[PDB]
């Protein structure tokens, strides 16, 4: 993990959608987080705030915020890419932007979190390709036609049966000393 939740946010004091990598507690962790986020703490601007060693990572994208959270150190850029990246992905994933579309393609969207990121690891590239992996496959089909068919033959037949029946060193020395 490098993120116990990704929650995609809309301005509302409320985060439009979320997923809980790990359950234990109740929303109050998440619920409390939601509250704080909605409040924004009046704070003016800035796309990042970490407070109390918790990264609250966000990106306004419009009236929307996409949010990630973490507490101990990270390499920034990567991160950014993601926020941004989210901001690339959605109109594809759930269709454009307005909660509803997403409301219909919730399943798709959550699926995307997992898919995209396996526990804080940047899994791939290529969205379409990303579609590919599941509920879009190939193997299963290959297998099915042949198999189904084979069985079918047995069945058909059955129908009848039925039917009828240097450098290092510089350092090293210095140090060594």
């Amino acid at each position: 993990m490098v993120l116990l939740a990704a929650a995609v946010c809309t301005k509302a004091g409320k985060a439009i959608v979320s997923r809980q990598f790990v359950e234990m507690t109740r929303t109050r962790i998440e619920g409390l987080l939601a509250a704080f986020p909605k409040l924004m703490n009046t704070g003016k601007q800035h796309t990042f705030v970490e407070t109390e060693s918790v990264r609250y990572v966000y990106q306004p994208m419009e009236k929307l915020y996409m949010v990630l959270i973490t507490t101990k150190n990270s390499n920034i850029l990567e991160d950014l890419e993601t926020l941004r990246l989210f901001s690339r992905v959605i109109p594809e994933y759930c269709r454009a932007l307005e909660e509803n579309e997403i409301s219909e393609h919730c399943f798709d969207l959550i699926f995307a979190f997992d898919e995209i990121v396996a526990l804080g690891y940047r899994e791939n590239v290529n969205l379409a390709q990303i579609r590919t992996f599941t509920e879009m496959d190939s193997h299963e089909e290959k297998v099915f036609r042949a198999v189904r068919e084979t069985q079918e033959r047995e069945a058909k037949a059955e129908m009848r049966r039925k039917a009828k029946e240097k450098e290092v060193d510089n350092f090293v020395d210095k140090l060594k000393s």
């Binding site: 800035h46 699926f111 997992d114 992996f133 599941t134």
Partner: protein, 290 residues
């Protein structure tokens, strides 16, 4: 006397899957509250072992996952073993994505009577030429290691040998992450091996070692040279990530005036290069510590 639970039931017929989808969403929302009162279980039960609807299964499944399962019925609703056999098959499924997806789920999953021969089952699935599937096992296993590590007991080595068989960086990266959590030692042995090779390689896996090494010294040291030999190589350092860590780890390790200088430089340039201010501040903070 009658209820809309039933109203949903006919819809499902009416559409098939489609209607059911709707039902899932509703159910979901209903579920979302907590809320539901049972009975549809039966329906679900009835149609689903004989039905496909993959997506739906995925919805279903997930639903099961998020929702409880040690349900006041048991534990299980009590069928947690029987239905699974199809699923086990799916899990068996020659069909690799399908297994992988399951696996993904499975990493989320943790339902034991079902697991046991699925332990066998999984083992087979590891062999499948797909790194996606195999990788998925790495999470899954991780999931075991806390829940019922023991379930499998021979693993840390088994993995470690596995690594030997292995060569997909993605999977490797993972492999490390888990491996040290099981036991560092194996990683280390390998570490010894890898020492020269590292430089050639992709970062992500490299990172993970940096954490590990840290904890052990405060507890105890005497280990250096072998490391050093490498470490110096690491004093190439060049990705912004690498560099970011690389100076950071160094300080962790050392603070010799020479050390002080080395890291310092890295920063200074970095900064200079640097653009995201947020970042800039951060290092200060470290610095502030320093």
């Amino acid at each position: 006397e009658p209820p809309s639970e039933i109203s949903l039931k006919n819809d499902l017929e009416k559409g098939d899957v489609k209607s059911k989808t709707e039902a899932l969403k509703k159910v979901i929302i209903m579920i979302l509250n907590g809320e539901k009162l049972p009975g549809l279980l039966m329906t679900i039960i009835r149609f689903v072992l004989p039905l496909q609807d993959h997506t739906i299964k995925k919805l279903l499944l997930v639903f099961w996952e998020i929702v409880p399962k040690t349900t006041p019925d048991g534990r299980l609703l009590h069928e947690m073993i029987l239905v699974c056999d199809a699923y086990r098959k799916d899990l068996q499924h020659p069909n690799e994505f399908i297994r992988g997806s399951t696996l993904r789920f499975l990493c989320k999953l943790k339902e034991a009577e079902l697991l046991e021969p699925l332990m066998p089952a999984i083992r087979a699935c590891l062999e499948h030429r797909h790194s996606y599937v195999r990788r998925n096992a790495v999470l899954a296993i991780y999931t075991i290691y806390r829940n019922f590590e023991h379930l499998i007991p021979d693993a840390p080595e088994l993995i470690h040998d596995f690594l030997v068989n292995e060569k997909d960086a993605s999977c490797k990266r993972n492999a490390f992450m888990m491996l040290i959590h099981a036991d560092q030692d194996r990683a280390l042995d390998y570490l010894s091996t890898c020492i020269d090779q590292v430089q050639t390689f992709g970062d992500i896996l490299q990172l993970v070692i940096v954490e590990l090494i840290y904890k052990v010294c405060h507890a105890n040291p005497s280990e250096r040279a072998r490391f050093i030999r490498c470490i110096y190589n690491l004093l190439q350092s060049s990705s912004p990530a690498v560099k970011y860590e690389a100076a950071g780890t160094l300080v962790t390790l050392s603070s010799a005036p020479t050390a002080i200088k080395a890291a310092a430089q890295c920063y200074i340039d970095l900064i200079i290069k640097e653009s995201d201010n947020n970042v800039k501040l951060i290092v200060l903070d470290r610095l502030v510590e320093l």
